[PDB]
Amino acid sequence: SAGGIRRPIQIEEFKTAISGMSDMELAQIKTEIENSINHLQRSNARLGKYIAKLEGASGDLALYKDSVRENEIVLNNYNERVDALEQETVYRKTGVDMDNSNVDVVTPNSIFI
Amino acid sequence: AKGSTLIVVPFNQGSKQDVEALIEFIYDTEKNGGLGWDLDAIIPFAAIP
Amino acid sequence: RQQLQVLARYLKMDLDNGERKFLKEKDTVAELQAQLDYLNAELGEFFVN
C-alpha cells in the first residue's frame, strides 16, 4: 500500500486518502506502519548501545546523535499517521375544567352544534 | 374599583360538602375564620362540556 | 421467655410476622372506610341504601 512506505509522508493528504478506503485496507496499512515503527525502535535500540558504549569514554559521536535524532523525525510521522488511523476508525462507529375555558358551554353554540 | 374586593377559593360544584362549607365560609363571622358577608347575587355558571 | 427467643432465632422463625401483616391491613381498613364514609356523606345514607 502507498500509506506507510518506510519514508515520511504529509498528513493532510493522508487524512483525506484514508477516508475513501475499505475497512480491510485500513487494517493492512495499520499493520504495515506498526511493523515500520518496530523497525525504527529496534534500530534506535542498536543506535542506543553505540551511544552508551562511546558515552562511557568527540569525532564519530555527533554522527550517531543526528542518526537517532533523524529517526525520531520519521517516527514522529509514524504515530501521527497511526493517530489518523484511530480518528478514521472512531468516525466509522457513528456513520375536568368546570371553568368554561376550553369549551364555553354556558353558550348554546360551544357544544358542537 | 374603590370599595371592590375579590376572593378566589378552590371549589368543586360536584361535591355536596364543598357547597355547604363554601356558603358557611361566606356567611360565618371573621372572628370564627369566615367572611361575615351576606350575598346580594349568585351566578352559578359553572358546568362541563 | 429467653429460652424460647434463642430457639426462634435458631429456626429463623419470626414470631411477630403475623401482627406486622395484621397492623398493615387495619391501616387499609381505615383507608377504605374513610373512602366509604366520604361517599355516604356526599350522597346521603338513603341514596346508598
Swiss-Prot record, chain A:
| Classification via PANTHER family | TRANSLATION MACHINERY-ASSOCIATED PROTEIN 17 (PTHR40422:SF1)
Q: What does this protein do?
A: ATPase-dedicated chaperone that assists the formation of the RPT6-RPT3 ATPase pair, an early step in proteasome assembly. Plays a key role in maintaining homeostatic proteasome levels and adjusting proteasome assembly when demands increase, such as during proteasome stresses. Function overlaps with RPN14.
Note in the entry: Present with 2110 molecules/cell in log phase SD medium.
GO terms in the biological process aspect are: fatty acid biosynthetic process; proteasome regulatory particle assembly
Alphabetic keyword roster: Chaperone, Cytoplasm, Nucleus, Phosphoprotein
Q: How does it assemble?
A: Interacts with RPT6. Interacts with the 40S and 60S ribosomal subunits.
Q: Name one GO cellular component term.
A: nucleus
Question: What protein is this chain from?
Answer: Translation machinery-associated protein 17
Cross-referenced InterPro entries, in alphabetical order? TMA17
Q: Which residues carry this modification: Phosphoserine?
A: S22
What does the entry say induces or represses the expression of this protein?
Expression is increased in absence of RPN14 and upon treatment with tunicamycin, an agent which causes accumulation of misfolded proteins in the endoplasmic reticulum.
Q: Is the keyword Cytoplasm assigned to this protein?
A: yes
GO molecular function term, any single one: enzyme activator activity
| Highest taxon, organism lineage | Eukaryota
Query: Any idea where this protein resides?
Result: Cytoplasm; Nucleus
Disruption phenotype annotation: Decreases cell fitness. Causes severe growth defects and an overload of polyubiquitinated conjugates when associated with a RPT6 thermosensitive proteasome mutant.
UniProtKB/Swiss-Prot annotation, chain B:
Function, in words: Fatty acid synthetase catalyzes the formation of long-chain fatty acids from acetyl-CoA, malonyl-CoA and NADPH. The alpha subunit contains domains for: acyl carrier protein, 3-oxoacyl-[acyl-carrier-protein] reductase, and 3-oxoacyl-[acyl-carrier-protein] synthase. This subunit coordinates the binding of the six beta subunits to the enzyme complex.
| Family the entry assigns | Belongs to the thiolase-like superfamily. Fungal fatty acid synthetase subunit alpha family.
Name under which the protein is recorded:
Fatty acid synthase subunit alpha
* Organism name: Saccharomyces cerevisiae (strain ATCC 204508 / S288c) (Baker's yeast)
Q: This protein's superkingdom?
A: Eukaryota
From the entire protein, which fragment is shown? 727 to 775 of 1887
Q: Provide the gene name from the record.
A: FAS2
Q: Which cysteines are joined by disulfide bonds?
A: none
Q: How does it assemble?
A: [Alpha(6)beta(6)] hexamers of two multifunctional subunits (alpha and beta).
Q: Which residues cross the membrane?
A: none
Q: What else is known?
A: Present with 17000 molecules/cell in log phase SD medium.
Mind telling me how this protein is modified after translation? 4'-phosphopantetheine is transferred from CoA to a specific serine of the Acyl carrier domain by the C-terminal PPT domain. This modification is essential for activity because fatty acids are bound in thioester linkage to the sulfhydryl of the prosthetic group.
